[PDB]
Amino acid sequence: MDDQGCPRCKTTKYRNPSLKLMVNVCGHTLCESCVDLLFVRGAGNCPECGTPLRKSNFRVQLFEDPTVDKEVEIRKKVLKIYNKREEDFPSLREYNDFLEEVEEIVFNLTNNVDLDNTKKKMEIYQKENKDVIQKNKLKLTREQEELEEALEVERQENEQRRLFIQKEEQL
Amino acid sequence: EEDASQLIFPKEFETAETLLNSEVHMLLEHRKQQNESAEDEQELSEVFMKTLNYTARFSRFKNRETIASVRSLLLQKKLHKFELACLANLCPETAEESKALIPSLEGRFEDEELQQILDDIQTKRSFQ
Amino acid sequence: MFYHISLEHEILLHPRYFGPNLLNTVKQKLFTEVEGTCTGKYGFVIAVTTIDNIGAGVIQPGRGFVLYPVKYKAIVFRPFKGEVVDAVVTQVNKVGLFTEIGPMSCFISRHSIPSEMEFDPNSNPPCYKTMDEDIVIQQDDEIRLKIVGTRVDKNDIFAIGSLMDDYLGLV
Amino acid sequence: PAALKRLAKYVIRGFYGIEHALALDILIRNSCVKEEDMLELLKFDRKQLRSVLNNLKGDKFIKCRMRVETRHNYYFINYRTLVNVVKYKLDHMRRRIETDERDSTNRASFKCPVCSSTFTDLEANQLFDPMTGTFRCTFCHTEVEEDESAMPKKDARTLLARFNEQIEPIYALLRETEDVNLAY
Amino acid sequence: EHFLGFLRRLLEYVKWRLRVQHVVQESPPAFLSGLAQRVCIQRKPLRFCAERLRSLLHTLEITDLADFSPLTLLANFATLVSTYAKGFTIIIEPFDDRTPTIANPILHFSCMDASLAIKPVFERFQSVIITSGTLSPLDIYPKILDFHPVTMATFTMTLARVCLCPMIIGRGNDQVAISSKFETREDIAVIRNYGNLLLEMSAVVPDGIVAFFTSYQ
Ligand SMILES: [Zn+2]
Ligand SMILES: [Zn+2]
Ligand SMILES: [Zn+2]
């Protein structure tokens, strides 16, 4: 919302900040009033670049920095890969070496051509998918579930503490 | 004022039913049988024949019963009458495709469930 | 889309048709004009499934004609803006593709055609093919087109075909 | 007053007549110079001075009320209004030019050389040959003419940016305004 | 480049979290969890953020650290939050006090217990003597700071002359309660009692007197 305005229609960005960026294969600071303008003609084409987002390729995002928008979306997609837990590797260096390669992949995708990244990602798909990728999908789902359970346990304990001290006072 | 995507329609497209290509073919076929009877009557219009060719080529479900059963399955789901027609007619292969086709379809149901509405119809279409 | 709706139409019956078989004469006459004519508000009308009811005949003073308001059920087809419908290509030309959807005919401008697609004048049958020949569009082929807008004239509706949207064209 | 209004009116003269610019500069003194004293100092013709003062008054710059007493024109330079008047003038102008930009993107797009009858892009079915490919006019089957102007090939326009830049001095002067005084 | 992008991500998250306008929010562990989920910033890589900042900034041969000090403060916050939140809390104030509407919100990371930070002193050093004057009663101090005291004695000054003669005045000339309560703060009678007491006390007391209030307002 801190951006000066859209490259074409920097108006709404001044009147109200309600508009949120729209992510695309192009990687852009697109705005809903401008998304309508893209829908009317082309229907999924970047105005200046003309990149054929035939799917309109639109998804909501909330950060004034377009570079952060693209980086966060690319990281979201990448996290689906190389999600194996650290303890799977006993080697000290290998704990974060693969994370280094992951973030290198993210930076490569942000600016440089993604053809090599896609070919590499196919290579990693084939092998880790045999065993490890689905296993770590399961384990990360388990840890998400248990963290939401633990936060609800914390909030049950806080509600019980509030209501029991109220019943202390009234009793 | 009216958008097929946004599920917005004028005051007349609310109560009337929606007909699929396969079901329409049966309606036209019945008239074709009627045309044979009552000889010396007015011949069908040329525009009428164009509908028969168009619908017959997209008769995904050859059997009459298959059309009714599919409709019954579609009726159960909490979808607008328009949404029932397009999904059967378009015959997308993946849920992501159907998402791009209709923007208002987004958010009505989870992606996995939408894919199931696609695959089950595919199995029925394959079985015929 | 194929919509089965009830229509309110009026019949001007000449007095010469009075006498025996006046009621079915109105029913027979109703099919004469309703079939073969279209209207933008309801789209092309294909057939009248049944006649819901027959109204009372109102006599026009001086004219001698009669006004029969008839409630009948019929299926209509109307293109809607921004929707994808299967279509058949009738004729192929460099400046535009002509496709027919039953009573409805649509014209696709060269600009709406994908940039990588090019007309094949050398081939005896006019057709559009790509450099790699991955996708080829020819007369009497199955394609899906996005309707940019619904425009009508002389009881005839023909729209523009947009192939920019994803999952369009032959497969 | 302050340097705000001084520089403001000094650059505000640039729009109206320079003959009005000298008269505006005479507000160097806020002493509310009378009309006849102005004839002595400005010395512009009584008719020319009258027209100039009335034109400067109409846009709400200055306010004058000669009382009765020799009569003494209550000359002034209303500065509080001045800033708002200039802001609204640019406010309406920025709007009119952007609307002119957007409204210039609509055209028939086609024509026939003879019969000079533009149709619309929608008339493609009528204006076309199943065979020849060239679009042919209805009541003269001899059309070839595509678009006199293809489309907004350029960015929005050099006009909007030219207003943005030529007014950067005005934008900067209104930034120097910066609400120096919270008074009425 | 990787570290710079990490700092960009965390700074964007903090910027948005601060820009949010709402009631004061507290979130010691939930802040870290939400950061990791929203912007994909794992706590373990976040832990070494400040140390890697020091090393990388040293590599750059910068002119001085004064210019980049705010970034170092933000890095210290970033590493601290990922380090621990058991006895801490992140508070967000979209609106500052004493201002109905201000465009300078503040995010606090105020601690709650001093034992966490003073533990190393007690553990490392064999004995620490907190010698203090005007000390409020010692019993609380072991509770606030987790340590086992050896001696708990209060020493009273003894002199041949009574150097100090403290007194408390609660009743004014009107025999009215003079408590400076929040609801009683506005009381003109109480303010008048304070003023008259100060007048007489200044009349009698020799040169030099200091009066301490409860707040600037
Ligand atoms: Zn905009
Ligand atoms: Zn672009
Ligand atoms: Zn002509």
UniProtKB/Swiss-Prot annotation, chain A:
Entry keyword Phosphoprotein: yes
Tissue: Highest levels in colon and testis. Moderate levels are present thymus, prostate, ovary, and small intestine. The lowest levels are found in spleen and leukocytes.
Zinc fingers (RING-type), renumbered ranges: 6-50
One GO CC term on file: transcription factor TFIIK complex
Modified residues (Phosphothreonine): T51
Keywords linked to the UniProt accession: Acetylation, Cell cycle, Metal-binding, Nucleus, Phosphoprotein, Transcription, Transcription regulation, Zinc, Zinc-finger
Domain called UIM: residue spans: 142-161
Major subcellular location class: nucleus
Quaternary structure and interacting proteins, as annotated: Associates primarily with CDK7 and cyclin H to form the CAK complex. CAK can further associate with the core-TFIIH to form the TFIIH basal transcription factor.
Protein name, per record: CDK-activating kinase assembly factor MAT1
Organism from which the protein derives: Homo sapiens (Human)
Lineage: Eukaryota, Metazoa, Chordata, Craniata, Vertebrata
Gene of this entry: MNAT1
Curated annotation (Swiss-Prot), chain D:
Zinc finger (C4-type): 112-140
N6-acetyllysine: residues bearing it: K57
Domain HTH TFE/IIEalpha-type: 4-87
Subcellular localization: Nucleus
Binding sites annotated in the UniProt record for Zn(2+): C112, C115, C137, C140
Subunit structure of this chain's protein: Tetramer of two alpha and two beta chains. Interacts with TAF6/TAFII80. Interacts with ATF7IP. Interacts with SND1. Part of TBP-based Pol II pre-initiation complex (PIC), in which Pol II core assembles with general transcription factors and other specific initiation factors including GTF2E1, GTF2E2, GTF2F1, GTF2F2, TCEA1, ERCC2, ERCC3, GTF2H2, GTF2H3, GTF2H4, GTF2H5, GTF2A1, GTF2A2, GTF2B and TBP; this large multi-subunit PIC complex mediates DNA unwinding and targets Pol II core to the transcription start site where the first phosphodiester bond forms.
Family: Belongs to the TFIIE alpha subunit family.
Role according to the record: Recruits TFIIH to the initiation complex and stimulates the RNA polymerase II C-terminal domain kinase and DNA-dependent ATPase activities of TFIIH. Both TFIIH and TFIIE are required for promoter clearance by RNA polymerase.
Protein name: General transcription factor IIE subunit 1
Organism: Homo sapiens (Human)
Primary gene name: GTF2E1
Part of the whole protein covered: 11 to 201 of 439
UniProtKB/Swiss-Prot annotation, chain E:
SUBUNIT field: Component of the 7-subunit TFIIH core complex composed of XPB/ERCC3, XPD/ERCC2, GTF2H1, GTF2H2, GTF2H3, GTF2H4 and GTF2H5, which is active in NER. The core complex associates with the 3-subunit CDK-activating kinase (CAK) module composed of CCNH/cyclin H, CDK7 and MNAT1 to form the 10-subunit holoenzyme (holo-TFIIH) active in transcription. Interacts with GTF2H2 (p44) which stimulates the 5'-3' helicase activity of this subunit. Component of the MMXD complex, which includes CIAO1, ERCC2, CIAO2B, MMS19 and SLC25A5. Interacts with CIAO1 and CIAO2B; the interaction WITH CIAO2B is direct.
Modifications the protein undergoes after translation, according to the UniProt entry: ISGylated.
Protein family according to the UniProt entry: Belongs to the helicase family. RAD3/XPD subfamily.
General function of this protein: ATP-dependent 5'-3' DNA helicase. Component of the general transcription and DNA repair factor IIH (TFIIH) core complex, not absolutely essential for minimal transcription in vitro. Required for transcription-coupled nucleotide excision repair (NER) of damaged DNA; recognizes damaged bases. Sequestered in chromatin on UV-damaged DNA. When complexed to CDK-activating kinase (CAK), involved in transcription by RNA polymerase II. In NER, TFIIH acts by opening DNA around the lesion to allow the excision of the damaged oligonucleotide and its replacement by a new DNA fragment.
Entry text on domains: Interacts with GTF2H2/p44 via the C-terminus of this protein; mutations in the C-terminal region of XPD do not alter its helicase activity, but prevent its interaction with and helicase stimulation by GTF2H2/p44.
Protein's name in the database: General transcription and DNA repair factor IIH helicase subunit XPD
Record lineage: Eukaryota, Metazoa, Chordata, Craniata, Vertebrata
Protein's organism: Homo sapiens
Complete-protein stretch covered: 327 to 543 of 760
Compartment list: Nucleus; Cytoplasm, Cytoskeleton, Spindle
